[PDB]
């Protein structure tokens, strides 16, 4: 199937004393494999999946070096952004950066991303062609021109089409027993009377991987969205995910209703009934 690698970075300025709180996480698909936290004791990039522990000391030295450089970049950014936006020293502010690559089923380059936010709003982002920038406002437009001057897009494009996909390929092989395995949802239905006249039917999907899934209700074989509640997909805590969808129905009429589940790990979709 198709796969991705993503790194996420958050810096939060700490006015009054010290450097920002900095947190960096790396993912293959929906699996976190590395982390850095400026507040943790090690001051090293740290493993978070068993299959990355294969990597030698040179890997960890190299990653620690780059990630700490990311944190310094963001430290400088927070100062610069403060001046661009005429903000005071008294407030705490946030920068966030995300980048990575997708690969198709043949594990060849599909897409690359690099995007950036200040205080939770779009700031600047690399466009799909990986050749140009989307700058949200005039502060970001000044950044756009600096980055054009410094050939940032060319440097990123080399990384996203080269290094990113090469290492993703490597991680997929090393971690194949978990990363290349699909866990189909474990499904069941529950019934909860709400009054003498109505009942909730709840359709559960448990222990699935990857996170992407579709849960829908049908009534008499037609799609039903009214009187339905769909919760956001949530981590079980063990690496897998959970979701449910619920519908309110007239009691006695439960049999008209069917729950439909689509997931990468199911050859064909599932249908549940009460």
């Amino acid at each position: 199937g198709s796969h991705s690698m993503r790194y996420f970075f958050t810096s939060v300025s700490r006015p009054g004393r010290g450097e920002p709180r900095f947190i960096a996480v790396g993912y293959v698909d929906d699996t976190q494999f590395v982390r850095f936290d400026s507040d943790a004791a090690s001051q090293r990039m740290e493993p978070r999946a068993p299959w990355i522990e294969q990597e030698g000391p040179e890997y960890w030295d190299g990653e620690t070096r780059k990630v700490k450089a990311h944190s310094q970049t963001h430290r400088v950014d927070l100062g610069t952004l403060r001046g661009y936006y005429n903000q005071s020293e008294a407030g705490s502010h946030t920068v966030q950066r995300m980048y990575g690559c997708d690969v198709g089923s043949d594990w060849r380059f599909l897409r690359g991303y690099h995007q950036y936010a200040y205080d939770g709003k779009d700031y600047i982002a690399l466009k799909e062609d990986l050749r140009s920038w989307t700058a949200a406002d005039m502060a970001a437009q000044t950044t756009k021109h600096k980055w054009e001057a410094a050939h940032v897009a060319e440097q990123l494009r080399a990384y996203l089409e080269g290094t990113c996909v090469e290492w993703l390929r490597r991680y997929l092989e090393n971690g194949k027993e978990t990363l290349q395995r699909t866990d189909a949802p474990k499904t069941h239905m529950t019934h909860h009377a709400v009054s003498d006249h109505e009942a909730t039917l709840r359709c559960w999907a448990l222990s699935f991987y990857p996170a992407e899934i579709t849960l829908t209700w049908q009534r008499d074989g037609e799609d039903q969205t009214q009187d339905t509640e769909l919760v956001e997909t949530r981590p079980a805590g063990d690496g897998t995910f959970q979701k449910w969808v619920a519908v309110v129905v007239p009691s006695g009429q439960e049999q008209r209703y069917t729950c439909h589940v689509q997931h990468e790990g199911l050859p064909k979709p599932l249908t549940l009934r009460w």
């Binding site: 790194y7 790396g26 890997y59 190299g62 990653e63 780059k66 990630v67 450089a69 990311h70 970049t73 400088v76 950014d77 610069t80 952004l81 661009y84 950066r97 980048y99 690099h114 950036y116 700031y123 600047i124 970001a140 950044t143 600096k146 980055w147 410094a150 940032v152 440097q155 990123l156 080399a158 990384y159 290094t163 990113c164 290492w167």
Partner: peptide
Amino acid sequence: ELAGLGINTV
């Protein structure tokens, strides 16, 4: 693996 170059200050 993380990017090195391409990650510039704003």
